[PDB]
C-alpha cells in the first residue's frame, strides 16, 4: 500500500532542525526523515523552500514513492508559519520550483502540528528548544499565546535564554556593572571552554558577524552540566528559567476553556522541546511560578505530556484535513504523562 | 599650503553614520564630509573599506587635494576599532583595493578618539547614541570599561535599548507576561505609529530579516517625546536610561586616577551622542545612580564635544607617524552640567 493510496507528509519545522514524516492514507507511518532549519524569520523563504524539498524528497526515497509522484498533501508547521505573506511565498516557490513534490500545501504553525499530534480536541502546548512559545487552541477553535517573540524580543525560558542569561551575567560581572547572585566561576570557564576563547572581546563575533542561534544556544548544555554538579549560577539560572515557562502558562489560564481543566488528569500541558529533558533543573522554578501565579480560580491540579512521535505526524493529519480527508490518529499513542501536581 | 604640507584625516565611527575630517599638518580643519556607518560587527569589514575610500575621497575632493595623492595618515575612530583581526583587515584591504587613500593608517575605538578631541592628559568618555560605552583611559595609559558589548548583550542607556525597552514592555503587558510599569497607551500606539503597522506580528520582520539597528533605535525619538508631553511610561523609560548610564559611570570609578577627580570642575565626563540631547529626561535616574554609588569624589562636570571625534581621530592618526598635530583642547569641548555632593 504505496503506490494505490495517497500519501500525507508533515514537516515539523521548529528549532534546531525540521523533521518530514509521510504517513499512508490509513494513518501508517511510511518513512521519517531529519532535515535543515526551516524558520523564515531567521533563513528566509528561499532556503526554506530548498531545504523542505530536499528532506521531502529523501523521505520520498525511503517509502520507495515513484520518482515524479506527488505527495497527496504536505502539511509544513514551522516556526513562523502564522505570518500570511511568507506562507503566500513559500507555497508559490514550492510549485514553482518544484512540481512534483505535493499536489496541495497547508502551511501552519509549529505549535498547531504538536496540538495536533496529540487531540482534536483543543489543548496548551509549552515550547521549550532554541526557543520557547505557549500556544493554546480551545475546543471552540479560539486561540491565545503567550511569548513565541524570537531571540530578539523574548525566547524567555528557552536554551537561547539560558545561555544568554549566563553570558550576560558573566559580562555584568566583570564589568562592576551588576554583581552576580552566585559566584561566576564555573560558568565563565564553561564560557571560554565552549565558545573556545580566551575573554569576552573573543565572544562578540558570536554574537554578531558569525551569529548561529543553534550554536549559541548549545552552551546552555553547560550550564545544564554545572546545575548537574551542583554549581549555585547554573542551578539558579536554570529556576529562574523553570519560572519563566511557568509564567507563559499562568499568562494564558484567563482564556483556558474551563472544560479543558476538568478530568483526573486536570490540565493537561504539552511539552515540546529539547529544554524539557532538563525538567528536574526546571521543576522548583516551575512551580514557584505556578503556585505563586495562580487567583481563586480553575484548576486542582496539571499533568505534563510529551509526544511520542513527531509533530510533524500533527502536520500530516492538519495537511490532510486541508483536502478533505480523516488521517486515522492514535492520541493514547502519541503522548504520555511524565508529571502531575496537585496543589492540596 | 594644500598640495606642499602633509594631510591627516580622522574618521569618526559613530552609530547611525560616521564623519571624516580633513586637517592641516598645523591643526586647521580643511574639510568636513558625512558617511555611512562603519561597525564592523554589523555590516562586515568588506563593506567598512568601501565606506571609509568613499567619504574621504569626497572630503578629499572638498579640500581640493590632487586626484591619486594620498593622505599622510588617516586615524580610523571606530566602533569595534580594538578587536585585531578586524584593524589588520581594514588596513589590509583598504591598501590594496584603494593605494592612493593615504600612506598610513591608525584603527582605534570611537571611544578614544571622542577623548583624544578633548584632552591629551587622560579622561573618561560615556556614549550614549545608538548605543552606549564607558571608556576611561587613565593618565598612565592604562584602561578599563563598562559595557560597548552593542545590541546583542548590552547598550543599556543608549537609544536601542531605550527603543527596545519600549516595544518589550508593550509585548509583554498584551501577553500578560508582566504588567507593565505605567500605562502602555502612549508608547503602543507610537510603536504602530512609527512602524507602521497594525499588529505586533507586524513588527516582526523589523526584529528579523529587515533588522536595521539604526531605523530600530530611530523609535526613541517617539519615547523622547511622550516624555516630554508628560506620558508617565515614556518618563519611566529615561529615568531608568539615566540610571544605566549612571550605573556605568559607578562601575567604573574605582579604577579611576584620583587626580582625575582633583580640581574646581571634579571629574570630568565627557558626554558624547545622541541620547544626551535628552538630559533633562535622563537626569533624576543618573543622579540617583550615581549617589548610590558612591555610597556603597567630590563632584562632576558633564563636558559635550565642539567639533567632531574625527579631529582626535586625526591628532592620533599623526602620533603614529611621529608629528605632533597641534590641538586647541579648550576650544574642542565645553561644560553643560556640574553637581557637587552634600
Ligand atoms: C520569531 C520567532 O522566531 N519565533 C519562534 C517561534 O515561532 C517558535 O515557536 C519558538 C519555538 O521554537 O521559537 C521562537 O520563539
Ligand atoms: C559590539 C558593538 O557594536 N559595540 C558598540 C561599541 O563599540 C560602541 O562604542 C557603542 C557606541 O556606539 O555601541 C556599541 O556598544
Request: glycine share 12%; net charge negative; with cysteine.
Amino acid at each position: 500500500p504505496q503506490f494505490m493510496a495517497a500519501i500525507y507528509g508533515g514537516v515539523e519545522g521548529g528549532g534546531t532542525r525540521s523533521e518530514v514524516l509521510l504517513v499512508s492514507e490509513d494513518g501508517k507511518i511510511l518513512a521519517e526523515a531529519d532535515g535543515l532549519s526551516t524558520n523564515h524569520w531567521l533563513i528566509g523563504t528561499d532556503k526554506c523552500v530548498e531545504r523542505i524539498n530536499e528532506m521531502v524528497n529523501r523521505a520520498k526515497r525511503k517509502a520507495g514513492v515513484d520518482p515524479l509522484v506527488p505527495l497527496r498533501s504536505l502539511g509544513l508547521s514551522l516556526s513562523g508559519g502564522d505570518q500570511e505573506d511568507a506562507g503566500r511565498i513559500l507555497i508559490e516557490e514550492l510549485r514553482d520550483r518544484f512540481p512534483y513534490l505535493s499536489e496541495s500545501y497547508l502551511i501552519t504553525t509549529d505549535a498547531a502540528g504538536s496540538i495536533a499530534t496529540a487531540t482534536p480536541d483543543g489543548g496548551v502546548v509549552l515550547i521549550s528548544g532554541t526557543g520557547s512559545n505557549c500556544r493554546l487552541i480551545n475546543p471552540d477553535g479560539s486561540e491565545s499565546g503567550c511569548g513565541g517573540w524570537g531571540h530578539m524580543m523574548g525566547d524567555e525560558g528557552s536554551a537561547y535564554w539560558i545561555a544568554h542569561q549566563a553570558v550576560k551575567i558573566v559580562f555584568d560581572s566583570i564589568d562592576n556593572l551588576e554583581a552576580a547572585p552566585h559566584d561566576i566561576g564555573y560558568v565563565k570557564q564553561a564560557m571560554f571552554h565552549y565558545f573556545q576563547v580566551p575573554d569576552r572581546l573573543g565572544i562578540l563575533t558570536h554574537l554578531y558577524r558569525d551569529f548561529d542561534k543553534c550554536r549559541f544556544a548549545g552552551f546552555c548544555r553547560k550550564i545544564a552540566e554545572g546545575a548537574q554538579q551542583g554549581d549555585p549560577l547554573s542551578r539558579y539560572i536554570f529556576r529562574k528559567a523553570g519560572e519563566m515557562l511557568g509564567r507563559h502558562i499562568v499568562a494564558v489560564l484567563p482564556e483556558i476553556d474551563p472544560v479543558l481543566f476538568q478530568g483526573k488528569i486536570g490540565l493537561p500541558i504539552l511539552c515540546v522541546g529539547s529544554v524539557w529533558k532538563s525538567w528536574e533543573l526546571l521543576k522548583e522554578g516551575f512551580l514557584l511560578a505556578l503556585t505563586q501565579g495562580r487567583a481563586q480560580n480553575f484548576f486542582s491540579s496539571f499533568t505534563l505530556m510529551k509526544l511520542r512521535h513527531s509533530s510533524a505526524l500533527g502536520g500530516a493529519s492538519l495537511g490532510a484535513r486541508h483536502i478533505g480527508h480523516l488521517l486515522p490518529m492514535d492520541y493514547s499513542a502519541n503522548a504520555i504523562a511524565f508529571y502531575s501536581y496537585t496543589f492540596s
